[PDB]
Each structure stands twice: as structure tokens, then as C-alpha cells.
Design an enzyme around this catalytic site. Structure first.
Site, PDB file in Angstrom:
ATOM      1  N   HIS A  61       0.838  -1.215   0.000  1.00 20.46           N
ATOM      2  CA  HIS A  61       0.000   0.000   0.000  1.00 20.46           C
ATOM      3  C   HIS A  61       0.858   1.244   0.000  1.00 20.46           C
ATOM      4  O   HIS A  61       0.522   2.231  -0.675  1.00 20.46           O
ATOM      5  CB  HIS A  61      -0.908  -0.020   1.213  1.00 20.46           C
ATOM      6  CG  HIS A  61      -1.739  -1.257   1.328  1.00 20.46           C
ATOM      7  ND1 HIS A  61      -2.724  -1.559   0.417  1.00 20.46           N
ATOM      8  CD2 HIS A  61      -1.691  -2.319   2.162  1.00 20.46           C
ATOM      9  CE1 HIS A  61      -3.311  -2.710   0.719  1.00 20.46           C
ATOM     10  NE2 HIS A  61      -2.665  -3.207   1.758  1.00 20.46           N
ATOM     11  N   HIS A 116       3.310  10.157   7.809  1.00 20.69           N
ATOM     12  CA  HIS A 116       2.678   9.771   9.069  1.00 20.69           C
ATOM     13  C   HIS A 116       3.669   9.018   9.927  1.00 20.69           C
ATOM     14  O   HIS A 116       4.166   7.966   9.555  1.00 20.69           O
ATOM     15  CB  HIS A 116       1.468   8.832   8.785  1.00 20.69           C
ATOM     16  CG  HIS A 116       0.322   9.592   8.181  1.00 20.69           C
ATOM     17  ND1 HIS A 116      -0.737   8.953   7.522  1.00 20.69           N
ATOM     18  CD2 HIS A 116       0.073  10.899   8.169  1.00 20.69           C
ATOM     19  CE1 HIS A 116      -1.553   9.874   7.064  1.00 20.69           C
ATOM     20  NE2 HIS A 116      -1.136  11.050   7.490  1.00 20.69           N
ATOM     21  N   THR A 195      -6.351   5.700   8.704  1.00 26.92           N
ATOM     22  CA  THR A 195      -6.876   6.020   7.356  1.00 26.92           C
ATOM     23  C   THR A 195      -6.829   4.804   6.425  1.00 26.92           C
ATOM     24  O   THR A 195      -7.160   5.040   5.243  1.00 26.92           O
ATOM     25  CB  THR A 195      -6.134   7.229   6.761  1.00 26.92           C
ATOM     26  OG1 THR A 195      -4.839   6.805   6.397  1.00 26.92           O
ATOM     27  CG2 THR A 195      -6.125   8.473   7.628  1.00 26.92           C
TER      28      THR A 195
HETATM   29  C1  LIG Z   1      -0.975   3.452   2.696  1.00 25.19           C
HETATM   30  O1  LIG Z   1      -1.017   3.407   4.159  1.00 25.19           O
HETATM   31  C2  LIG Z   1      -0.321   2.526   4.839  1.00 25.19           C
HETATM   32  O2  LIG Z   1       0.499   1.828   4.246  1.00 25.19           O
HETATM   33  C3  LIG Z   1      -0.582   2.507   6.265  1.00 25.19           C
HETATM   34  C4  LIG Z   1      -1.337   3.539   6.865  1.00 25.19           C
HETATM   35  C5  LIG Z   1      -1.590   3.656   8.206  1.00 25.19           C
HETATM   36  S1  LIG Z   1      -2.360   5.048   8.876  1.00 25.19           S
HETATM   37  N1  LIG Z   1      -2.542   6.107   7.761  1.00 25.19           N
HETATM   38  O3  LIG Z   1      -1.490   5.523   9.899  1.00 25.19           O
HETATM   39  O4  LIG Z   1      -3.648   4.683   9.279  1.00 25.19           O
HETATM   40  C6  LIG Z   1      -1.036   2.676   9.041  1.00 25.19           C
HETATM   41  S2  LIG Z   1      -1.267   2.731  10.853  1.00 25.19           S
HETATM   42  C7  LIG Z   1      -0.880   1.080  11.438  1.00 25.19           C
HETATM   43  C8  LIG Z   1       0.612   1.041  11.682  1.00 25.19           C
HETATM   44  C9  LIG Z   1       1.062  -0.308  12.241  1.00 25.19           C
HETATM   45  C10 LIG Z   1       0.380  -0.465  13.633  1.00 25.19           C
HETATM   46  C11 LIG Z   1      -1.163  -0.465  13.510  1.00 25.19           C
HETATM   47  C12 LIG Z   1      -1.666   0.791  12.723  1.00 25.19           C
HETATM   48  C13 LIG Z   1      -0.201   1.676   8.513  1.00 25.19           C
HETATM   49  C14 LIG Z   1      -0.084   1.533   7.112  1.00 25.19           C
HETATM   50 CL1  LIG Z   1       0.995   0.315   6.664  1.00 25.19          CL
HETATM   51 ZN   LIG Z   2      -0.938   7.023   6.929  1.00 25.82          ZN
END
Ligand SMILES: COC(=O)c1cc(S(N)(=O)=O)c(SC2CCCCC2)cc1Cl
Ligand SMILES: [Zn+2]
Length: 257
Positions: A61, A116, A195
Site C-alpha cells: 500500500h 505519518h 486512514t
Molecule cells: C498506505 O497506508 C499505509 O500503508 C498505512 C497507513 C496507516 S495510517 N494512515 O497511519 O492509518 C497505518 S497505521 C498502522 C501502523 C502499524 C500499527 C497499527 C496501525 C499503517 C499503514 Cl501500513
Molecule cells: Zn498514513
């Protein structure tokens, strides 16, 4: 099977994750005229001196710079937060063109990308338990605009060709995330969610006002990544952002002016 495409993208997520239509979803548009200055908010404490990056990774992603979060090394505190939040990983969201890519918007302005830095509240012991709590996570969001290069970003961009594809990782020790921060720590904050699926409503968002600059070459290297694994029809990793969601019954607070 969720992603960023026409048939598996954000409009479809709610079929597998009904909280997509919940009361505290992210991102949001930050209407700057409406956000209220809260003189009771504390300066953010970003303590990244002892951060241990372990690894960088292509999760299909986005990509992510992971950290050792088995002790209080890299932590976020103060600001709106109660207690201590350990840095777990950072990643980015970006566009196919420079006029889109960010998740939060500012007066409807989209930035080229958004960083982020994801932290979890040590009171809950581990990130899986923190995901289940309304104050489990704190995400520091930083906008990227395209102009001059960000020298502290270069070590990340230069390794992306080794993780072109989903499920690739590499060592990434000794990366210093302090290199990704803008000068000012002035911020907006509101209660929201992840998100990406599972879209858990566990996040205190802290969005910095000041964007960082990255060069057109740097962001072009993000857009050379692939959403696929080593071996399917090639689909460039671009436009991996969720659009703004309804603010609902929430207030965005400003740490300044
Ligand atoms: C394209 O977005 C991402 O690839 C992604 C986006 C998020 S976000 N935007 O922070 O919601 C998270 S958070 C996730 C990190 C690992 C621990 C649990 C939550 C992890 C991922 Cl891996
Ligand atoms: Zn993110």
C-alpha cells in the site's frame, strides 16, 4: 483485497469495515478559519534522539520505516496527549501528480504527499491492545510540497529500488527521523482514526502546519514503487491516499495564533 483502485478503493472499504462510516473517521479537511486556538495545549515533545530504525518495508500500500518499540527510545508526548507514545513506524501517502497525495487537506488544499509517524500509548502495553482504545495511537502528520530537496529524506528514497515490490524489506538502521521534521512544531489536533483498514477509531491526530519541501526527483522515486508483488501486471504505487471524511461532531484545535 482492499486497496486504492476503482473496484477496491476508499468508496468500497465500508463493505468490509463498516466503521468507515463512523463518527470519528480520518483524514479530514482542516478549515483554518474554524479551528480554534487552544491556549491550554502544550508544545509537542518529539524525543527522537535514541530512535532505532530497524527496517524499511513495501507493504503493498505504501512503504514503512520501522523502529524498535520494545523500550521508550523514540517517544511523543505533550501537545494534546496524556502519557507517552512510542514511535513504531512511519510511512507516506502520495499522488500521481503534485496537486494530490495528502490525506488531510488545509482549506481544501491538497499537498503532494503526507508523512505519518505512528506512535502507540505505552499504557496499553502493545500496539494491538492500543488499536482497541480511543486514545491508543497518536499519529504525527507532516505535509510535503514539491520544491527544494529534503536532505534527511534522501537515505529513504535511495533504498526504494530494493523494495520495488510488495513484501520486500531491507535493513535500515541508523535512520534519524528528526531529518524529516519542519522547523516549527505548530499543529492542529483532533480525534480520528486510522486512514487504512481496519479504520479503527483509536487515533489522536497531530498535524503540523508547516510542510516540508521535497524535490521533484524525490517524489518521482516514490511513484516508481509498485503495488504489486514481484510478478503480476505492474501497477505503479500512486494515489494511496484516502480522501477527507465528514468532520461530524468534532472540533479541530490549533496550538497557535
Ligand atoms: C498506505 O497506508 C499505509 O500503508 C498505512 C497507513 C496507516 S495510517 N494512515 O497511519 O492509518 C497505518 S497505521 C498502522 C501502523 C502499524 C500499527 C497499527 C496501525 C499503517 C499503514 Cl501500513
Ligand atoms: Zn498514513
Amino acid at each position: 483485497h482492499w486497496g486504492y483502485g476503482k473496484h477496491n478503493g476508499p468508496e468500497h472499504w465500508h463493505k468490509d469495515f463498516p466503521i468507515a462510516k463512523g463518527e470519528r473517521q480520518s483524514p479530514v479537511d482542516i478549515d483554518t478559519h474554524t479551528a480554534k486556538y487552544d491556549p491550554s495545549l502544550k508544545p509537542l515533545s518529539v524525543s527522537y534522539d535514541q530512535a532505532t530504525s530497524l527496517r524499511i518495508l513495501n507493504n503493498g500500500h505504501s512503504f514503512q520505516v520501522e523502529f524498535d518499540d520494545s523500550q521508550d527510545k523514540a517517544v511523543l508526548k505533550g501537545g494534546p496527549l496524556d502519557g507517552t507514545y512510542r514511535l513504531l513506524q512511519f510511512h507516506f501517502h502520495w499522488g500521481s501528480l503534485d496537486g494530490q497525495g495528502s490525506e488531510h487537506t488545509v482549506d481544501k488544499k491538497k499537498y503532494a504527499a503526507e508523512l505519518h509517524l505512528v506512535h502507540w500509548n505505552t499504557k496499553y502495553g502493545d500496539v494491538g491492545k492500543a488499536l482497541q482504545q480511543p486514545d491508543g495511537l497518536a499519529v504525527l502528520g507532516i505535509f510535503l510540497k514539491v520544491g527544494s530537496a529534503k536532505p534527511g529524506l534522501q537515505k529513504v528514497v535511495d533504498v526504494l529500488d530494493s523494495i520495488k515490490t510488495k513484501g520486500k524489506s531491507a535493513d535500515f538502521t541508523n535512520f534519524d527521523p528528526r531529518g524529516l521534521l519542519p522547523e516549527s512544531l505548530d499543529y492542529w489536533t483532533y480525534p480520528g482514526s486510522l486512514t487504512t483498514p481496519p479504520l479503527a477509531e483509536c487515533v489522536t491526530w497531530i498535524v503540523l502546519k508547516e510542510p516540508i519541501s521535497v524535490s521533484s526527483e524525490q517524489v518521482l522515486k516514490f511513484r516508481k514503487l509498485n503495488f504489486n508483488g514481484e510478478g503480476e501486471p505492474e501497477e505503479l504505487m500512486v494515489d494511496n491516499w484516502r480522501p477527507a471524511q465528514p468532520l461530524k461532531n468534532r472540533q479541530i484545535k490549533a496550538s497557535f495564533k
